Amino acid sequence: TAQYSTSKTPYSPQQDIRTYQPPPPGFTAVFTELVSRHGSRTPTKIDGADLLLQLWAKARDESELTSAGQDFGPTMESYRAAIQKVGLGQETGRGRQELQGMADRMQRRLPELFEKIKKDATPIAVVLSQQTGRIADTAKFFTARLGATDPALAPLIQQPVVDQDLLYFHKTERGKAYRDYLENDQRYQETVKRIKNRDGTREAATDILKTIFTPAFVERMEPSAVTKAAQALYDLDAIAPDLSVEGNWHLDRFVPRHAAAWFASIDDAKSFYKKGPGFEGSDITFAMASILLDDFFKQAEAARAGKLGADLRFTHAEEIIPLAALMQLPGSEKQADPDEDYTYANNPWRGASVSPMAANLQWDIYRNGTTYLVRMLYQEKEIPFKPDCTPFTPGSHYYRLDELSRCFGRTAR
Numbered sequence: 001t002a003q004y005s006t007s008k009t010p011y012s013p014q015q016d017i018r019t020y021q022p023p024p025p026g027f028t029a030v031f032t033e034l035v036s037r038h039g040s041r042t043p044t045k046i047d048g049a050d051l052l053l054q055l056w057a058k059a060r061d062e063s064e065l066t067s068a069g070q071d072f073g074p075t076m077e078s079y080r081a082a083i084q085k086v087g088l089g090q091e092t093g094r095g096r097q098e099l100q101g102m103a104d105r106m107q108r109r110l111p112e113l114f115e116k117i118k119k120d121a122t123p124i125a126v127v128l129s130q131q132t133g134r135i136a137d138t139a140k141f142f143t144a145r146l147g148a149t150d151p152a153l154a155p156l157i158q159q160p161v162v163d164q165d166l167l168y169f170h171k172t173e174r175g176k177a178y179r180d181y182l183e184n185d186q187r188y189q190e191t192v193k194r195i196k197n198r199d200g201t202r203e204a205a206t207d208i209l210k211t212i213f214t215p216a217f218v219e220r221m222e223p224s225a226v227t228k229a230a231q232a233l234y235d236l237d238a239i240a241p242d243l244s245v246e247g248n249w250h251l252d253r254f255v256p257r258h259a260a261a262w263f264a265s266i267d268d269a270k271s272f273y274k275k276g277p278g279f280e281g282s283d284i285t286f287a288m289a290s291i292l293l294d295d296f297f298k299q300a301e302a303a304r305a306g307k308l309g310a311d312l313r314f315t316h317a318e319e320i321i322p323l324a325a326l327m328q329l330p331g332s333e334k335q336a337d338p339d340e341d342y343t344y345a346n347n348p349w350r351g352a353s354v355s356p357m358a359a360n361l362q363w364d365i366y367r368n369g370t371t372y373l374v375r376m377l378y379q380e381k382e383i384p385f386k387p388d389c390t391p392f393t394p395g396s397h398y399y400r401l402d403e404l405s406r407c408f409g410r411t412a413r
Contacts (some may be wrong), residue, residue, distance in 0.1 A: 006351030011358035028304025039095025093245025205230030
């Protein structure tokens with residue numbers, strides 16, 4: 001959906017549901033549970049667009065625009081206005097489409113579950129990090145779609161409940177040690193400084209600005225303004241695909257592909273240490289997510305009582321990212337050696353795969369007799385659990401719930 005957009009990459013499901021492993025013979029879906037980031041959104045801040053528009057107007061007045069740069073003003077003005085019409089930090093039309101597709105595929109993959117929910121009039125729970133905003137709108141996209149395609153589900157979907165410890169832990173007391181670490185840990189601070197100071201950023205930044213402005217205009221800027229304006233333009237280019245329903249502004253005209261690749265690698269390195277697996281031997285960035293992993297188990301274990309058909313949770317990237325690191329999900333299984341800083345060559349973690357827009361984890365719970373199995377989807381790709389968890393049969397992506405409990409340390413056996 002985009003090459004260098006890191007955590008702003010629009011969502012796409014990573015597997016076709018027709019190719020999931022089929023449920024083992026005799027097993028039927030009895031419960032499902034989800035945690036999803038909000039869908040594609042506008043940027044949270046507009047000051048970068050304004051910095052660029054102010055520099056553009058100055059260069060225009062000085063006759064210091066390139067040929068392509070003549071159209072930068074009108075393009076950025078249009079893009080800014082479309083962002084403001086949606087609202088900063090708000091869901092876009094593409095975000096709505098993303099969540100609708102997720103709801104469609106949930107229903108298509110678990111038809112027997114939704115049939116059972118309707119026979120038994122079983123409620124569907126909705127849980128949010130916050131009462132209003134992009135998280136609440138994301139939930140409504142999903143639940144409205146369930147009710148549009150299957151109208152009998154609409155009365156069963158409960159009014160949302162807010163649970164900030166479960167779905168907003170980086171901002172609650174659960175995140176106090178984490179926030180203190182980011183603010184005060186010297187190894188962390190020195191590592192971030194090394195990333196910000198990597199040789200190459202100045203060249204990538206001047207390359208970006210020279211698409212719009214004559215070289216002399218760029219050399220006349222103070223170097224701090226150069227890096228700030230280039231960062232702002234890279235960021236606006238990176239999130240433009242989120243606004244695909246609202247327009248196509250061809251912002252790549254102004255960000256050379258190699259420079260976008262460079263800035264993406266810097267953003268991913270910063271995020272790896274701030275939010276992701278971080279340093280070998282430390283769980284400071286992700287222990288706080290244990291409440292959410294716990295809740296996946298708690299809801300699955302409660303499925304034997306059958307009082308809930310599904311549990312749908314909506315949150316931010318900063319909750320999904322540490323959950324993936326805590327569970328050692330693919331891409332999040334390699335912490336960094338303190339003696340070798342993260343790079344794309346030495347680590348598989350990427351914002352685009354760990355935390356795209358609408359990043360989501362789902363567990364489907366299947367039953368035969370008294371046996372309960374779990375199948376896990378990550379960005380809608382069916383994935384194994386960490387390797388000390390043993391599948392139901394060799395090569396299976398289905399796992400006994402009691403085996404998952406054991407391999408995650410919740411029970412002895």
